[PDB]
């Protein structure tokens, strides 16, 4: 199975659920979030999970994320 479903929640955008391949990097995940909600990508966008910033260079499958987990987009 390739996909994991995540809830990406933000201050100023509606909730976005994405089903993304687990071999995408955290950066890929941000990039897809951006084209999906029609905002411009930049390198200072971060994702928070359990009070820690996800490392953009980590593959999603290398993180503690699990199916249906909420990630906060900052």
């Amino acid at each position: 199975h390739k996909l994991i479903t995540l809830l990406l929640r933000s201050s100023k955008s509606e909730d976005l659920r994405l089903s993304i391949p687990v071999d995408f990097t955290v950066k890929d995940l941000i990039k897809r979030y951006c084209t999906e909600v029609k905002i411009s990508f930049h390198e200072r966008i971060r994702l928070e999970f359990e009070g820690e910033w996800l490392d953009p260079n980590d593959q999603v499958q290398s993180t503690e994320l699990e199916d249906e987990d909420q990630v906060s987009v900052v």
Binding site: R9, E50, Q70, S72
Partner: protein
């Protein structure tokens, strides 16, 4: 056990849906899976208040008798606020067994309740004398120290 079962279900629900900017997770147990009885959480200041920009850290210690008894919630480090004891312990009606605590109260309700309290202190139960007095007598200085505390706590 009920205590562990409840805490598991709260964790399950929280990780899937929680207020933006908040975080909450059990500590690692000695072995170490999860220590469901001790969580580390973060409560963000509300926008357009002097608390804005701060992410305020708390521990929640659950007793063996939870959910019949409430968790103990302690800002770490202790917070400048009229309703926070010098220990960091929060003073709030829903966290009091003899007042507002019910087994139905959730971790989410507790953290939102504490967040609400930050910018709307309960003047009728001072837990700290510095912040209380200053709040009631020197509102400008009060808000000034709150803004600095917020910068001290930038995520």
């Amino acid at each position: 056990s009920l205590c562990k079962t409840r805490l598991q279900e709260e964790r399950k629900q929280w990780r899937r849906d929680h207020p933006f900017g908040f975080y909450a997770k059990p500590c690692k147990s000695s072995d170490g899976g999860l220590d469901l009885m001790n969580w580390k959480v973060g409560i963000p200041g509300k926008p357009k208040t002097s608390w804005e920009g701060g992410l305020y850290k708390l521990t929640m210690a659950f007793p063996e008798e939870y959910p019949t008894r409430p968790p103990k919630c302690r800002f770490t480090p202790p917070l400048f606020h009229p309703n926070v004891y010098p220990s960091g312990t929060v003073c709030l009606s829903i966290l009091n067994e003899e007042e507002g605590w019910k087994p139905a109260i959730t971790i989410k309700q507790i953290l939102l309740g504490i967040q609400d309290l930050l910018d709307d202190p309960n003047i009728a139960s001072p837990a700290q004398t510095e912040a209380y007095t200053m709040f009631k007598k020197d509102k400008v200085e009060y808000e000034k120290r709150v803004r600095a505390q917020a910068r001290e706590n930038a995520p």
